[PDB]
Amino acid sequence: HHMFTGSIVAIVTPMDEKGNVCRASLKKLIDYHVASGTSAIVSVGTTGESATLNHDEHADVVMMTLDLADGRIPVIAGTGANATAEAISLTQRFNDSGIVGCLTVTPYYNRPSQEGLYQHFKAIAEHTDLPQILYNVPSRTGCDLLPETVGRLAKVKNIIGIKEATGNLTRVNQIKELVSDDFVLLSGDDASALDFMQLGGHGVISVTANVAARDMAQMCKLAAEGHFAEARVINQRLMPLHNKLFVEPNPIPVKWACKELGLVATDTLRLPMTPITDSGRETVRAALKHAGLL
Template identity: 35%
Template sequence: MNASDFEGVFPAITTKMDAAEDVDIQAVRADVRFQIDAGVDGVIVCGSLGEASSLNADEKVAIAEAAVAEAAGGSPIIMTIAEDSTRAAIDLVRRVEKAGVNGLMVLPAMRYLSDPRETMGYFRTIAANTELPIILYNNPVAYTVDLLPEHFQQLADEKKFVAVKESSADTRRINQIIDLVGDRYKLLIGVDDLALESLVLGCVGWIAGLVVAFPRETVAIYRLVREGRVAEAMEIYRWFLPLLSLDIGPKFVQKIKLAEHAVRGTSPVVRAPRYPLVGDEEAQALAIIKRGLENRPDLTKYGF
């Protein structure tokens, strides 16, 4: 991948499970095909939405292989690295590099709450053990570990760090990073319900969640903003916002898989310790999804 390849819409796909909570590899391939056919610019596998924390390394490699095979070189496949230790991360990086993935999205090591020195050292160690381009993922809201704009400035000398997924929910950081390092990184927004604002402020890509159920609407918003048609993008975005709220909170995987099931008929099964939604939580999510489907915009109005 070239740096320019890190622009556009990148769905972080869910990992489909069968009734026994085993990974459904054919469904993984179907998801990749569904997204590519809808016009996305690349596909991210085994992220937080992909239930990375409950997948073992062999499953992650199998998912990577399936996604690469389905894409067949037509769209880049990016593997999420979200392991508990530096050693485990390096081992997985080496395995998925052999599987043919095109890039990596790297989270700070899980469980241990590293300080900035440790986090940056972790990122640099991974870069030293791969030839693949890397998206650095910053999400202090979910993972507590936080890298500030000045830390990304310190990391800018490593050429393999080509992009930053900025998910702090503080849109000020977009311009702060740009002020410090200009266009050194491709800035990608990773918070669905701050996407349009962040694209206007300078992000050139959107790593999205609800795209898994609504890829064409997501792509339309992105392209309209990039074309300067912000008012038209806002019309779709305001319809989308209640649905995008499903991407927030600890049960975002269950909610988004429920949305996919309602829209596409795919499996809503999640792997324990996650349980399916029940009661008011399920009813509220279904009401948002139902309303969204009833009022789904006609994209032909915007040329899509």
């Protein structure tokens, strides 16, 4: 449980101008999260450009993140794939790496059934001893892992939680009532995450935490302590970021914000991500200023 709760950053993969991982920038981010009280780092999720790294660069970024973390902050590896054999293969690369767990997205594009999702995640879970956090994000995947199937999978010993990114807050108690008390419920939607914690959620895997780590850590700890009015004060400060970090496709805005705050050298991404527009720059700058970060 506890390690997989609070503010978990869906960390950018900072790049040089050629699109290659920038170690010095990642080191700065990881020292930042250690200092800020971030609970854990998700390495090569969606915000980390999993889509545009091959499995070798993917593995390199995860092992680099672990190495820079140096035991100071838990690392969760993104291990999602839309082929079950590939998800198992990617998961096996990190067995005994030192990561504490895996974040495994529902297959994207091929739109499996609820039985396909069950057989997919069960097969992955049987090929590792690592804790598995299911990841539901239908806007990106074209499929919806429903609470009934979550309940089914929760019975598998090392399936320990879900990163629910629908923004549909009815999912919190629909899942909670089909699962044991130590099954972890994490928001994957920054704008609705405090609401998600107020309904019983245990934390959030956050893009906003990339640039407001100390605020996001404080908001999740206040939510866990049941101080929701104090948590809402931080959430109101952060809400323009929660929204405007998606004004253009994630992670285009958050990489620009990281660069503007001096957290990374370069806001470079890989195609088909393209540089932030003038209009997006002014929108994200107004949001950083609203959060008191600029």
